[PDB]
């Protein structure tokens, strides 16, 4: 039960940061431009069984475009992402949506305004209207705040499975094993542990 998911948008918008946040739970602060495409499997546990997305995280920078619309073929859903702090990223949404629906003429598409955590927001809410005439779903999201980070996938899973009451559900919690530490390297797992102690945790000014 696996679907192909193409993720387009201008560079810097947060495409791969958003996907990484769902794969591992981490937030990546460094911008390392994607090169062509990165494919990742991503699984969610619903009340109608598991659902797997093959997320084709596409590159935004033109100089790293790779196959470009070659990545869109046989897609079954897609996210277009822009940056609510960068007006031009929303200006180009009609261009990404152009190349995406010429290859994929009938798929559920989510439009995402990332970076709503930044307070000096440039792309005002009342001005976001591209999704109306084109039957796209829209969400404000922030991969840093996790605000609405669940919703693009929940909506898409509701449209591909065909169930409007599909919901996310808690995984089964297997009973953890009983393992004693290894005394052969126990004398060395203070090396790996002191490093960790002396490396300050990121974002000590957050609420958690």
């Amino acid at each position: 039960v696996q679907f192909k998911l193409v993720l387009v948008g201008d560079g810097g918008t947060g495409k791969t940061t958003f996907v990484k946040r769902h794969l591992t739970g981490e937030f990546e602060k460094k911008y390392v431009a994607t090169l062509g495409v990165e494919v990742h499997p991503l699984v969610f546990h619903t009340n109608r069984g598991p659902i797997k997305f093959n997320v084709w995280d596409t590159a935004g920078q033109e100089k790293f475009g790779g196959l470009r619309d070659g990545y869109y073929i046989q897609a079954q859903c897609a996210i277009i992402m822009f940056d609510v702090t960068s007006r031009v990223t929303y200006k180009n949404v009609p261009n990404w949506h152009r190349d995406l629906v010429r290859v994929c003429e009938n798929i559920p598409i989510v439009l995402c305004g990332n970076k709503v955590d930044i307070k000096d927001r440039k792309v005002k809410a009342k001005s976001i209207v591209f999704h109306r005439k084109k039957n796209l779903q829209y969400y404000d999201i922030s991969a840093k705040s996790n605000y609405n980070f669940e919703k693009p996938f929940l909506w898409l899973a509701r449209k591909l499975i065909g169930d409007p009451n599909l919901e996310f559900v808690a995984m089964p919690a297997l009973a953890p094993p009983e393992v004693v530490m290894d005394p052969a390297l126990a004398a060395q797992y203070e090396h790996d542990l002191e490093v960790a102690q002396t490396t300050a945790l990121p974002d000590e000014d957050d609420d958690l």
């Binding site: 769902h22 591992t24 739970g25 981490e26 937030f27 969610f44 546990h45 996790n146 980070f149 669940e150 996310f168 559900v169 808690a170 995984m171 089964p172 919690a173 297997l174 009973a175 953890p176 094993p177 009983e178 393992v179 004693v180 530490m181 290894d182 797992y189 790996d192 542990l193 490093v195 960790a196 102690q197 002396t198 490396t199 300050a200 945790l201 990121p202 000590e204 957050d206 609420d207 958690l208």
Partner: protein
């Protein structure tokens, strides 16, 4: 869901990190409710913690008595400790975990609850 036969000894909101030894960085693993679950059949106590909206498991392992909660150089509201058997993502891997709370009081209460659970497992 597989926690029918378990009692909740303690619950606290927390952010959990894992240490990437290669890249020298702390990386977030999840944010949600951290629970101490005592199995009613075996009387072993585990940490189980799930992410907020996806409810995915980001930590599930025994609160082994071998473990020790150390402080982090940059926080008065977190603890660092080694973990050799955690099955959150599948096969039992080993990790160095850091967990941060909303206040120094939450951290201290956690440490109290953490080793209270350790003696229970020592039985």
């Amino acid at each position: 869901t597989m926690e029918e036969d378990e009692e909740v000894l303690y619950k606290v909101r927390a952010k959990l990190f894992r240490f990437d030894a290669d890249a020298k960085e702390w990386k977030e693993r999840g944010t949600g409710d951290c629970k101490f679950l005592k199995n009613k059949k075996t009387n072993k106590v585990r940490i189980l913690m799930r992410r907020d909206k996806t409810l995915k498991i980001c930590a599930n392992h025994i609160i082994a008595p071998e473990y020790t909660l150390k402080p982090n150089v940059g926080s008065d509201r977190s603890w660092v400790y080694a973990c050799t058997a955690d099955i959150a993502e599948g096969e039992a891997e080993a990790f160095t975990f850091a967990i941060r709370f909303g206040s120094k009081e939450n951290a201290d209460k956690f440490k109290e609850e953490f080793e209270k659970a350790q003696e229970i497992n020592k039985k």
